[PDB]
């Protein structure tokens, strides 16, 4: 029984490829899919965080939908402390990106009575009066419910449905009002405090970038975050408004547009070009459009991102049950596998690691499945189709990338070492899905950090000062990579490896490729 | 925006196909994936069952892992009552298969103290003594645990792991014994009563067909079940032992081997040939082998079954969360979609409909997703690869099937009407995955019933007596199908439809195909 | 209107590719298909030869089926004189290979009366007596015909057919004899002197390597020919007998087995492995087997050679009519195009350049068509299928080759510069059919010369002494290539180019590849 599902790799057709998957075919050590973990109570701890890093964490997500700047400021402080605790050995140090998740134009209810279980009980068929009067802002009963969206009455006529708390509870507007709405509970349940509200099929006129959002964004720039996950991007315009706030200083912060509404899906393409990467926000998306259609959008978005060479993230409830159990459900297990198979650059945990009882177990599980799923990819067809997809381009780096991935498949290289400062060279190699890991060695820390956004890139930060002789500085970097790999168990002395470097210091792209043995 | 994801159907590549999926492309009314619902407390009711049928139920699963013959006898009685309640109109009557799920060579614990919450609490690190003494059979403490597997000590040495309750709780044998084992709780939790036990990597010497199993099987034959889902089939031999018990009388009961252990996966092929269909028992499978590998086995088994033309079922925890909530999680939604996309003939609910609070909602959800996912298939490539896969065969019915599916894709037929008595003709048409529904009209009830096992076949039972003139009897049957379709909303007058019939009464296969308009 | 038929290159299917061919899409300057010209009266002249070289000649074929060693000795002398006349400028000097074509186990008639038009007239239905008596060796009438095959009577029974002069004339053995045969003229015609004779379906017992052949072979070694086109190779054994005569000295002379009989086709594979390259000797082949089947053998042999990475030649009557006219027939035009499209490494002229009235025009015509046809190839599918074909191999140079060709397609490189001494590296790159020209720079002259055998390789001989510093010696060679290309009009300053070099002097293969701009 070969390994890395290679027997299936040799398949002519998909059905064949599929038929040849072997549960006894061991995957390699490198896990190419990036793992984004949302930090919170269950993971705030520096010690916990250190354990997260060791378990596979690559990006720490700060969800500004809750918490105060003071809060996140410390969260970020801890992840950095945790990260740098390994900063010792440059060979074992693993960069960890910091991402700020916008609390975009979203609707939420107020606080519940308090002594009513902090959770009322809407009965299937009961009447519920929605109010905009800030008085009941923190006193929500089974009859009174306050929400922060003031113009709610300016866009919802009688009959329309208003969902609350991850669409689990639905309400039908029975009667309109000036600053209130009386509705009928359709889906019963126990309403929580300050839960999310969805107005599917409704021109919600909240601003792409709210006032709070501008503050949060500025905050992120000052706190040097590596990327922004912009919530509810519904058009290229929104992305631009966001990029603007980040301004000249936040200039290098990668913007990841989140697709969570029907318009965003409908106007995906312009949003894609305007953005640096995309996130399939399955959560709100599953409420704004029929749940049974979310998979369509996912595969379409991942597909189109893969084609465009832009990072894409699959997010929300992937390992949901693990918030309370140490093992995920069969559906959750397959969900992760398929996202990787779909082509997602990164998978995410949020809740499973933010406030669940098994943050570490959840991270480990994603790491395990990804590896397993990655080997299961149909690399040959993938590469071929990816190639046809971009045939109109004749970019030199692209050519280098494709030539390298090709070569790597052919001699089954142990890895591809790419020396890059902007990261472009490595991104490009990742675009064409090699099977082996891509060790990108850079002296730029933010590059190393943002690199996680790309499938297969395993960043390494060279901390040695530039050597006088270019040739030497290159060997220096290449050797660092050779060690990281040997240490990380990616390959041992003797294995073959592809190496991409520049021609002169500060080259435009890695124009040089060579097959080399591991020292 | 076309429908049935047809724009994507026109794709040249997968990435393209993927990129073209449209959430606004409406699927057709017919849902080709069979839905198997496990019956229990939450669904025992004849009235509930009638509602299940209307919601999409196609096969009622009786799980003999629990309950008494008296119990199941009544369950079966009710589903039949519920079914026949529609027996009135032959146009609206929907056949419903009865399946018996074996309680194979499985290990279970005994009953818990009772006043201890009927659930003890094993603490992470605590010591737990496993006992075989039938005295504690119904008195299991946090220190005493009884299990029904007597030879457990004859196959588990010190150090080995023993999982309990869907592998959520793990234990490590610290010390051996004659009829007992002292272990250390690794994964804490609240042990329930009579929970399943897994000895991954352990030659469990329980018999393929136990003594109780022989009784249950005989019972099923006398109760005229349509199929048997044989648990823990680990080799072709086991299937044969099973087929034997069913004997001459149970001769036509389709045997569905369940793959739940590592050996069954490893010896899949012989098991496949020996069996009529297969079930991917994700539950035990996810405990016997690493969870992160279950997807590999699923796709491999579905792939190989599709190739072999034998029915395959995807089962366990697909819509798990719906046991308590009215809406499934994003992962569960995608899990179902992917199983359909994987090629599974049938999807299953067990727990979601056996004892959960939303049996109907769960059935409806599967029905919705399947439709959605079915349109999303890459039919062209699928058909092509399926064809290459079986090119060595030159079977006449196969040729007819392929010719028909081909024709159907080309003129976008509304459906394929197949007159069959054994069902072979329709099975064969289903083998080559047409996009449209396959209306199989038969006078044989058990055929109609078992037909659900196949993707796309929508059985119709002709209850009119055989007509004197073959030509007439054919039009009779064809017209019935034409009505069912018109009634069920599959097509209206004018639409095109492919019709496969025999040449003489009692033909070997439907050798005649013709494009006809809907009257 | 793009160029190089690139719009068609982008095609998904063949029908598409085909449909997109554009007569207004200009091909590039480099002509990848090697052109082999048979030298004779019409081309013996050093001045004519110089003109041949300028017109495209790459290999000069010496046909030992006629002429004396003294003759060929001078022919070879002249081609060399002609070649070296350009030896001046190493940038414009074009290597020209010398090939010796064996006069294998072939049958020929004697001389005709003389005053009978040096051509008798066999009438359809007349009787003709074949004789082995050396007396009529130079006195052949319409009744008497002598042939050099002594054992002709030991393998041809009454009824069998004996063809004469390119099968244009057929005869049926009416009666047997001891040293004679009386036959009936079936196909009338004007018999010439010393014409070829074919005994299709007859165990002709002539030796693979005749006595004269051993002399001719030894002669070729002493005259340092680059390759031997071995006539009538009917099995691997024959090739070996040939390689043996060439012995230790002729050790590096490439042996090209000629497939001209039914056995050679039937035992092709062993012949292929035993040989260095193959020649589709359409001439005799079209007489030994039905003419209407020759195309089958051609495509099969070219196909299998392409797959094996061994040079294949398409030969005989490609531009036949041009022996007397300045323009070829429509069929001849397409014949050449298709041979190139078939995948033939080299096309040949023999007669068109040996004794026709338009040697130069014929060479120019092949050159024109090849270019045109080369652009018309379906490179993408070709590369993909070529890759699948050899997937079992994991050769490092192969990987480099494939990676490079891939890269070259992607950025539409102007050419691939390969520094090689044995030629292996360049051969390998040619194996995977890049679209651009392959400039192989070598210091080995015989390598440069034999390189023509491979599609796309444009040899360049570095005549500068090895430089002290490897790095320098490499740039030296690379720069030479850069100049040849600029001079030859293959590319100008700025264009992109792929460069393959070794890692240390005398490397095993070019393990280094880099995209570089033309200085
Ligand atoms: K948020
Ligand atoms: K069972
Ligand atoms: K010859
Ligand atoms: Mn959101
Ligand atoms: Mn089971
Ligand atoms: Mn010949």
Curated annotation (Swiss-Prot), chains A, B, C:
Residues annotated as transmembrane: none
Modified positions (N6-acetyllysine) in chain numbering: 50, 77, 154, 254, 258, 293, 310, 463
Names of the cofactor(s): Mg(2+); K(+)
CDD domains membership: Pyruvate_Kinase (cd00288)
Gene3D superfamilies associated with the record: Phosphoenolpyruvate-binding domains (3.20.20.60), PK beta-barrel domain-like (2.40.33.10), Pyruvate kinase, C-terminal domain (3.40.1380.20)
Keyword Lipoprotein attached: no
Entry-linked NCBIfam families: PRK05826.1, PRK06354.1, pyruv_kin
Stated name of the protein: Pyruvate kinase PKM
Organism: Oryctolagus cuniculus
Encoding gene (name): PKM
